[PDB]
Amino acid sequence: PEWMILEAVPVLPPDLRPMVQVDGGRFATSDLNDLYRRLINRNNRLKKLLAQGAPEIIIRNEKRMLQEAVDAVIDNGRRGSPVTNPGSERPLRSLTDILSGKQGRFRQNLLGK
């Protein structure tokens, strides 16, 4: 029942994509990362924000961040985590609607070769 978690595990390759010109626009970036970040930052701010004695209330309210922060790389299925925050917009490619989902990667590279 090692379903409890203590070490999410994201790769890095897929992202480090850089400048695209022609016609009329350039500049270049990726997602899953800025999506990833959410995590580490928290899981990092937790530790250093406890060691300096952050009594009760605070502690949980934070920590849990990781939890929520974990339902990140995983599946955005609840309230959402739009980019452009506040940003009333698009859905962070969190293995939902894309990668593993349907018609994004799986339904794509299985036959849509």
Added chain:
Amino acid sequence: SDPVRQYLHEIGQVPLLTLEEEIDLARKVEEGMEAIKKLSEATGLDQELIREVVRAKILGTARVEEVDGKLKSLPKELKRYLHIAREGEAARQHLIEANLRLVVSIAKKYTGRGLSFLDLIQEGNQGLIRAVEKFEYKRRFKFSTYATWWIRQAINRAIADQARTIRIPVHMVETINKLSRTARQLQQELGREPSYEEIAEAMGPGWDAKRVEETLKIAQEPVSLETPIDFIPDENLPSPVEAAAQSLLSEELEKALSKLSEREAMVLKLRKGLIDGREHTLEEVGAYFGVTRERIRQIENKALRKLKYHESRTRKLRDFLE
């Protein structure tokens, strides 16, 4: 609905403090690290061990105990210091619990720049943890809105530290806000979106145009939105046809080197570094290959020609394009 409401309930459920209860409790911290400093230099615990290792114990709602050991063997000059530090251990008891609510109502401002209301509390709230602490109990202004700074100033240091940007020292945000407010400044006082060089004057020393452009070329919040519309293709990393035109040129040379003499072929191999990758000098080639450079240098050029001469009469001058 955000999980904030959950916290917003636990936070605004417990009352703050009266007024005199703010200081009375604080003074316990002073003599806290002080009375703990007694044992600090006493055995050399740097006054941070006895406290940090005990504040854990103070948080007896969760871990350790340990240190007490020697703190009970208390000599004839001790037992009073046992309670003092345990009465002072109450210094880290109630304080810190009130403010949690007092702050939040501040983060309602930075509801934009970066980090959602919920993450901003982490930074904002944590600033209180440090600021609570270095409170000059002396002054007669009493804790309150005076903490707001530590919070907000820790919030600005937060939004700076964290943003969909790579690395932002106050070297660009404070400057981009400039050209921004400046471009927006000249704007209302002109009518058209001012150029880049036109802003140079607005700024000053060293502020030409190139630099004004280098800044708004790094970031603010662009770096694309990431993935709209595998929003973009392209390629050329391990080129397919290339890695195939590679083995050719090589195997091709092996053939183009067939009509060669060992006292020249190998001479070339090692020389230009074809054997493995050792671009051995002409000395290493001369040592092993006995004879001193003389006839060797000639064998060197003896090649080239005998290697180019065999080309114009038989194509292969196309392998160069790859």
